[PDB]
Amino acid sequence: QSIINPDWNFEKMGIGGLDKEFSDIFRRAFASRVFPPEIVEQMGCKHVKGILLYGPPGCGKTLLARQIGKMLNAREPKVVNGPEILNKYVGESEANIRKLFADAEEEQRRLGANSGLHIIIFDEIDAICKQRGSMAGSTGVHDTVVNQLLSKIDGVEQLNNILVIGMTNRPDLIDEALLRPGRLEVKMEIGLPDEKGRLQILHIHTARMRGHQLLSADVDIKELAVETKNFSGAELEGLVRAAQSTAMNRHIKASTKVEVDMEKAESLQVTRGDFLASLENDIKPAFGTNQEDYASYIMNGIIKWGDPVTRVLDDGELLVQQTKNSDRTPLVSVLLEGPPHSGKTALAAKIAEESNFPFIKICSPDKMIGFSETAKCQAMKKIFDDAYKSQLSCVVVDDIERLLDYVPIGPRFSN
Amino acid sequence: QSIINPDWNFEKMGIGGLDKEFSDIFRRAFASRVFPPEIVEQMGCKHVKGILLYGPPGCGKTLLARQIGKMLNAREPKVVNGPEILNKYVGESEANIRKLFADAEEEQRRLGANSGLHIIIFDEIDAICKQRGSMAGSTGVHDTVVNQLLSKIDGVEQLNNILVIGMTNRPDLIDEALLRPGRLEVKMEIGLPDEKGRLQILHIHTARMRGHQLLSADVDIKELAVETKNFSGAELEGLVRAAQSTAMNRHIKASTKVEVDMEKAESLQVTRGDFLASLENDIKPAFGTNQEDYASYIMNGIIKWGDPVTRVLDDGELLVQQTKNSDRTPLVSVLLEGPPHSGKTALAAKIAEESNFPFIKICSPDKMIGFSETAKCQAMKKIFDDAYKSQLSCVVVDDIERLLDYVPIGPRFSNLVLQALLVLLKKAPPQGRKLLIIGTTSRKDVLQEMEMLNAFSTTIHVPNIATGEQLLEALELLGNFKDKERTTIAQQVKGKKVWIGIKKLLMLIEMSLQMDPEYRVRKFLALLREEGASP
Amino acid sequence: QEDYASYIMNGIIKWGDPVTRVLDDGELLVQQTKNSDRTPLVSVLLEGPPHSGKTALAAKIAEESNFPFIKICSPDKMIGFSETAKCQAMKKIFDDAYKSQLSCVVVDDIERLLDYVPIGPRFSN
Amino acid sequence: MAEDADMRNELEEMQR
Ligand SMILES: Nc1ncnc2c1ncn2[C@@H]1O[C@H](COP(=O)(O)OP(=O)(O)OP(=O)(O)O)[C@@H](O)[C@H]1O
Ligand SMILES: Nc1ncnc2c1ncn2[C@@H]1O[C@H](COP(=O)(O)OP(=O)(O)OP(=O)(O)O)[C@@H](O)[C@H]1O
Ligand SMILES: Nc1ncnc2c1ncn2[C@@H]1O[C@H](COP(=O)(O)OP(=O)(O)OP(=O)(O)O)[C@@H](O)[C@H]1O
Ligand SMILES: Nc1ncnc2c1ncn2[C@@H]1O[C@H](COP(=O)(O)OP(=O)(O)OP(=O)(O)O)[C@@H](O)[C@H]1O
Ligand SMILES: Nc1ncnc2c1ncn2[C@@H]1O[C@H](COP(=O)(O)OP(=O)(O)OP(=O)(O)O)[C@@H](O)[C@H]1O
Secondary structure: OOOEEOOHHHOOOOOOOOHHHHHHHHHHHHHHHHOEEEEEHHHHEEEEEEEEEOOOOOOOHHHHHHHHHHHHHOOOOOOEOOOOOOEEEEOOHHHHHHHHHHHHHHHHHHHHHHOOOOEEEEEEEOOEEEEEOOOOOOOOOOOOOHHHHHHHHHHOOOOEEEEEEEEOOHHHEEEHHOOOOOOOEEEEEEEOOOOOHHHHHHHHHHHHHHHOOOOOOOOOOHHHHHOOOOOOOOHHHHHHHHHHHHHHHHOEOOOOOOOOOOOOOHHHHHHHHHHHHHHHHHOOOOOOOOOOOHHHHHHOOOOOOOHHHHHHHHHHHHHHHHHHHHOOOOOOOOOOOOEEEEEEEHHHHHHHHHHHEEEEEEEEEEOOOOOOOHHHHHHHHHHHHHHHHOEEEEEEOOHHHOOOOOOOOOOOOOO | OEOOOOOOOOOOOEEEEEOOHHHHHHHHHHHHOOOHHHHHHHHHOOOOOEEEEEOOOOHHHHHHHHHHHHEOOOOOEEEEOOOOOOOOEEHHHHHHHHHHHHHHHHHHHHHOOOOOEEEEEEOOOHHHOOOOOOOOOHHHHHHHHOOOOOOOHHHOOOOOEEEEEEEOOOOOHHOOHHHHOOOOOEEEEEEOOHHHHHHHHHHHHHHHHHHHHOOOOOOOHHHHHHHOOOHHHHHHHHHHHHHHHHHHHHHHEEEOEEEEEOOOOOOOOOHHHHHHHHHOOOOOOOOOOOHHHHHHHHOOOOOOOOHHHHHHHHHHHHHHHHHHHHOOOOOEEEEEOOOOOHHHHHHHHHHHHHOOOOOEEOOOOHOOOOOOOHHHHHHHHHHHHHHOOEEEEEEEEEOOHHOOOOOOOOOOOOOOHHHHHHHOOOOOOOOOOOOEEEEEEOOOOHHOOOOOOOOOOOEEOOOOEEEHHHHHHHHHHHHOHHHHHHHHHHHHHHHOOOEEEEHHHHHHHHHHHHOOOOOHHHHHHHHHHHHOOOO | OOOOOHHHOOOOOOOOHHHHHHHHHHHHHHHOOOOOOOOOOOOOOOOOOOOOOHHHHHHHHHHOOOOEEEEEEEOOOOOOOOHHHHHHHHHHHHHHHHHOOOEEEEOOOOOHHOEEEEEEEEEOO | OOOOOOOOOOEEOOOO
8 A cells, every 4th residue: 555645635734835845855855755665675774763943933834744644544643732741740741752652662563574654743843852951950840751752763673664753943952862863854944935936836826816816906916916025924824814804804884783785695796905014913923024113213204304315215225235245255234423413323224224134123221120130141142143034134233332321430341 | 401592593683782781791601501500509609690781872882781681581571661669559659660580489389499581671771770869759659669669679589590681771770789789780781882883784784785786886884984073873874774765765756646656666776876875964972073073164176376284184193102102291282373364273273184083173252152150161071081991082173362351351151161171181081082172263462461372382484475476376265266367366466575364365255256347456456555564 | 999090091101300309298298197196287388389199099099098988089970060069079088088087088189170261360268 | 729730540450
């Protein structure tokens, strides 16, 4: 019997923006289980028993795991939701771990090399698999569970019919022995998509509407793909859902009694105004940007009262060009200085707005009132860490003298 | 009846790189049981009944245990997988432990001396055996378990037909009473292999492919052995597995349905390109300094714009040779000093790379942003301990003025880090081992004021670009401006002295390139004029 | 037993008169602390320019004596320690010393034990 | 202060 289902198709999965990752996973994990067995026996190679997926929230790890589970002709997978194995009696949270491997061992011992495949899924794996302390008097809360898992995955008795999948948001807290090439050998990052992936996702989520002539004809998907920069896979689905809800609400009256005009519901169609209204009032991204912050920092506009304004703007434009088009210098910085009340922060904000980069952020002391220096360092580091996950980024540091807590007397400041 | 299976061969068990350890184990454990019995009785000695293996992950302890179990002619071994003994009811863990020794006692009491051997294996032994009186919660069962095990291995009654094997990753958490002679005598460490061991392992894991003619003729194992530095056995096997998967994938098409040619599947070959591609994108070691670090620390390479570039490297080579050869000075130190934007970190990294020592590390402030004094001291101490465990080591410390938080106003700095550095600069490693330390800085007078400049053995100067000939040679070696523009530039620079760093010149050139094709050299010369000089 | 090989790594060679003199003085002092009841405590300080070999000579003087108890306190073990841990360690060493009938203690690198820096200056009180 | 952590239990059987 073939490992893959006879009726499986790639286009039925419903996943857009992750072709390379799926290709790598398929090559590394399933290539040897589809090739004829005689040649694989002549090579003396074992099968891969582990996969790890990591990335920021909302990008498609659980959907991918579910589809992988659904694509294989095997038993029904086993799912573990977080710390579902913990118990209060001694020795009872390790029997739960041991119970997950009984059928695989039985079928191995019975059927030899003709057995099937057994899948196990660990959701929120970091909840139970943190690093062992390895210091006397600093032992972890439960290092026996980690030891049991390590001994079960790779031990004296050999299994060749298992596959383990895990998902996490904090990959830097997992034990090191669990990630070596013998236990969880394939490790993949799921990140934000680009314009092509956004277009694919929009097509995936609008196909069914398009099928039944429920979508207006003033709607252009390629325009939406351009307009939605640095969206995850969940935010686009939320946008479509909000547009549908806005379209549906026009045919209901609520107040005295809820009534639906079941005569105009036949001529129902979703227009380009619903999408526009949703973009403005409902969905706000996390690695994107919105127009309210600029309105907060550029309050009374910008007027051309002389020559210096044009000079400053041109100087900013040329550094934007250099940072975009340079390979030897991926990092460039600049300082704007002048007398007080001369209007430099607004000029910096204008330059950043005119850059047209996908990621723009402003670091201000207005959001660090009463903080200690450690908290300030942590906040700055957090701001700078989010920017490394984008292809082009711009950061603005305002009021450096307020950030250091400088006073002329003494003087005093934070080192 | 011998205790060794008649059809046993050392090449059948497939372990490479551990000949010396196996020889030691065989001498210390099985020598008495193979030697003729009458002379052994005349000696009046007892047998050994304990082995403990420890080391880092992925180095081959479980394989050793399994193959040793298969080697001996005896009953099937008993294996305990981690904490399988724990139970919820009172007296039930100790009963589980006492069930492991029943048959040995029965046969010793029945057949006496003429009895077979009994083998017991403990995997992840550190989970159930720890120092007594160290747990704050749920210790009541743990201490009783430890006491039962101790009383069972060596008690009033004496057994002479048991052997116990343990494997661990944390040897320092185990009870000391368990490791004394008579209970667990033979302690062995399993570590990373050297080049010859890597070659042995790589030969082991390709024999079937070579035998069945599935391996291409352009693959050279020796090049792979030289290239795969800092790898362990598990990674060496994973690399081969990845290469095999890449070779297989060329005959499977999966767009709508999954199909296999089955006509070209025959005549399958594994080539060198598969191995190279895997080494680049699939397998990466988890120890030491690798290519990803050298890429960041040396971004634009090294260009010979003048004579001093070779002088620095020659001095570094001399110091490296002195460290390698001399035996009365196991520890050496050096400091690289110069003005800002001169390229000290890149040169230090280049020298360390050319050293070719087994151990290399780089301590930089950009990996410890926001840390306190104690965390910095702990990180430095850990790195230096890791360096000490090796045989010959090299360590680099760059941006010293940033490691200790120095600001001219005040001044202000961290005294704890300064004291730690001063203590570490004069500490020697264990006898028979050698260490080289390289440091970089940009403020030598400040270090002199703090009395740190006398803790270094020597210093090397790194100068700037001083004359127009060197500037034009650098421009030629970068190829940014054509000959026609370079003539105009030479019309201006040759009649003057320049003072510019290598790192600043690249910035000036990339700023100038943004102008239109007509205003490029003019902007470049304007910026160079703005630079000024201060030799 | 102290690992005397670490502190004395290249032996001692009599390149001139002063070496002998120094050793003689040490011997004399040892005798005094062994055959005295009015002064059950004695102290001495070795000072000189850097890279002169004070630690090796002190270790040799301590070793030549046949006292039951001999220990050396060095900053090489107190790296990253607070100013309370150092006090606790010194107190423990001296408490161990008090037990024996005849005790000898060596305190080397006093300036590194106080965290001295000439800028300001700074030190632990 | 920090609230005491969670703890395990032992159990005892009885016949009838
Ligand atoms: N690449 C994608 N293609 C299509 N839909 C996607 C994609 N990524 C996310 N989605 C949509 O978003 C939904 C929620 O995402 P999912 O559950 O896969 O996220 P996740 O990465 O596990 O998140 P978290 O880390 O927050 O748990 C999916 O069911 C799907 O509808
Ligand atoms: N041409 C212009 N350039 C800059 N700001 C302008 C201009 N025309 C109007 N403005 C308005 O002037 C104000 C500029 O104030 P801003 O916060 O930038 O001051 P600042 O120089 O940073 O002062 P300080 O930090 O000392 O308070 C904003 O309201 C901006 O809208
Ligand atoms: N010396 C070696 N020679 C050949 N193959 C080896 C060697 N060491 C490891 N391997 C390969 O690596 C695989 C994993 O090694 P093994 O399970 O013995 O390591 P371990 O040290 O017990 O691991 P851990 O500390 O992670 O529990 C072995 O099955 C074998 O395939
Ligand atoms: N001959 C060379 N010597 C050194 N660096 C060179 C040379 N040729 C090119 N480079 C490049 O110049 C840059 C040198 O920067 P580096 O960080 O080493 O300077 P630095 O003097 O330590 O810096 P800073 O004063 O900012 O701390 C690196 O990109 C290096 O690749
Ligand atoms: N005659 C000698 N007297 C003293 N030390 C000698 C003599 N001959 C050789 N040595 C060696 O010279 C070195 C002198 O000891 P050491 O390095 O501790 O000196 P120090 O002056 O205390 O050092 P530092 O200046 O670093 O505080 C030791 O290796 C010692 O073995």
